[PDB]
């Protein structure tokens, strides 16, 4: 009926890790190659994604126990979850009012059309936007948002993980935190765990489609040359 000391500690360091890697001022965005509105927006969104990958790596290194996995597992976890964690963390700038991601100025407001001009087809965008709204409607507590990103990152069922048992144990402890938090701390949350765990299933499908689209870009050098080294390493198929 009450979170343990060990639970509240996990939550505190998860929240702090997030606050240290997500800057609500978005002032770093002015350093990206500017947005243009052929593929006008691929330079700017490639930089947005590359920069966000670095933040996600930074968050991951502060998840309890992630750092004590092998470097091989850390990479395996990161290479397969980065795009999902980006999709999750982006919900913090998504607006149901605008149906867009609003990051400061009108120059870093990303419409659906902005993302088609970076290569995406509506068969990736339609479920991406649908996913942001259902997640936004979930009205998650900050504690929950961060738990969910950490649970997503610590999935043992990803291509290439080795110490499967250890990652599952980490992820199990985080789920128990999440369930306890929702029960104790979230009025009317009796249905919320299930909804959140469904959002993880949605992220897998988004991952699948998105990784197909990545493949078609990366096979055209005139577009892959517009990506960043971090992006190509992380979304690339090297093992």
């Amino acid at each position: 009926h009450m979170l343990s000391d060990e639970q509240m500690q996990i939550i505190n360091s998860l929240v702090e890790a997030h606050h240290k890697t997500y800057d609500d001022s978005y002032s770093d965005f002015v350093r990206f190659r500017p947005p243009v509105r052929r593929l006008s927006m691929l330079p700017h969104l490639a930089d947005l994604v590359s920069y966000s990958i670095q933040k996600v790596i930074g968050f991951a290194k502060m998840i309890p126990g992630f750092r004590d996995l092998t470097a091989e597992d850390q990479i395996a976890l990161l290479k397969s979850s980065a795009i999902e964690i980006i999709m999750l963390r982006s919900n913090q700038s998504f607006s149901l009012e605008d149906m867009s991601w609003s990051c400061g100025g009108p120059d870093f407001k990303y419409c659906i059309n902005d993302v088609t001009k970076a290569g995406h087809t509506l068969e990736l965008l339609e479920p991406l936007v649908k996913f942001q709204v259902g997640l936004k409607k979930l009205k998650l507590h900050e504690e929950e948002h961060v738990l969910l990103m950490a649970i997503c990152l610590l999935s043992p069922d990803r291509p290439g993980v080795q110490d499967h048992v250890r990652i599952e144990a980490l992820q199990d402890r985080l789920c128990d935190v999440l369930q306890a938090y929702i029960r104790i701390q979230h009025p009317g949350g009796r249905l919320l765990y299930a909804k959140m765990i469904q959002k993880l299933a949605d992220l897998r499908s988004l991952n699948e489609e998105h990784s197909k689209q990545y493949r078609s870009l990366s096979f055209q050098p005139e577009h892959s040359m517009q990506l960043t080294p971090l992006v190509l390493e992380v979304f690339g198929s090297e093992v």
């Binding site: 790596i57 990479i75 080294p229 093992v239």
Partner: peptide, 10 residues
């Protein structure tokens, strides 16, 4: 391999 990721992972 994963030169940047290793570095970033410290």
């Amino acid at each position: 391999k994963h030169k940047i990721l290793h570095r970033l992972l410290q």
